[PDB]
């Protein structure tokens, strides 16, 4: 066959269902109908205690657990991706995997609108030109056609420059560390002469 490439490669057995769920929802152009139908089901477990009894209670028979789920999802225009997923997770008793699929469905979705989050920490609050010169620095730290959003915080422990935090890497072009990276270079070099 031929499925779309998932943007991220993820972990296993709950992140592995979510990347299969993303791939059949990218083939059907249902990447946001399936996503909010997950988000409805997250809310459906909070309100109905007998719906979450179909995911935690081990003494629910599997013939009950797949017939409550199918006869409840037969209408209301749910995606055929969704009501096939939910009878599959109810066949195996994996309905409690659903908080963990929804989290990994988000990370595949947010890497599909290449929107990457950010946090910029500066010394004092920015100008409108200090904002514009900074994204020109910062979209050279995302390696594709990605867009950075931003989040602006302040710290006068920095002496100007900035710290960009991407939640999996940071880049420190602040001059408070440029001082320390200068000092330790000349504290190493006078000991080499």
């Amino acid at each position: 066959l031929k499925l779309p490439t998932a943007p991220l490669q993820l972990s296993g057995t709950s992140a592995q269902i979510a990347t299969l769920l993303w791939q059949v929802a990218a083939k059907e152009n249902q990447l946001d109908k399936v996503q909010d139908e997950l988000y409805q089901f997250i809310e459906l477990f909070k309100q109905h205690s007998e719906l979450r009894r179909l995911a935690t209670d081990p003494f629910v028979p599997t013939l009950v657990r797949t017939k409550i789920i199918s006869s409840v999802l037969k209408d209301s225009g749910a995606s055929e991706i969704t009501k096939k997923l939910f009878e599959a997770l109810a066949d195996e008793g994996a309905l409690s995997a659903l908080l963990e699929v929804t989290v990994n469905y988000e990370e595949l979705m947010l890497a599909h609108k290449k929107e990457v989050y950010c946090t910029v920490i500066t010394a004092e609050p920015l100008d409108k030109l200090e904002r514009v010169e900074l994204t020109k620095k910062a979209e050279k730290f995302v390696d594709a056609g990605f867009k950075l959003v931003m989040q602006e915080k302040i710290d006068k422990k920095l002496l100007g420059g900035f710290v960009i935090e991407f939640s999996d890497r940071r880049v420190d072009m602040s001059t408070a560390k440029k001082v320390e990276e200068f000092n330790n270079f000349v504290n190493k070099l006078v000991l080499s002469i």
């Binding site: 592995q16 299969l20 997250i42 477990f45 909070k46 935690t56 195996e92 994996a94």
Partner: peptide
Amino acid sequence: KALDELRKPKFSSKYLIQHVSQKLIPAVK
């Protein structure tokens, strides 16, 4: 928190995706 029962899943099958892929793929047009 009332959703905290579902935060940690454990499965009865190591090959759970091989059953899930046999029901999600024929949901495609």
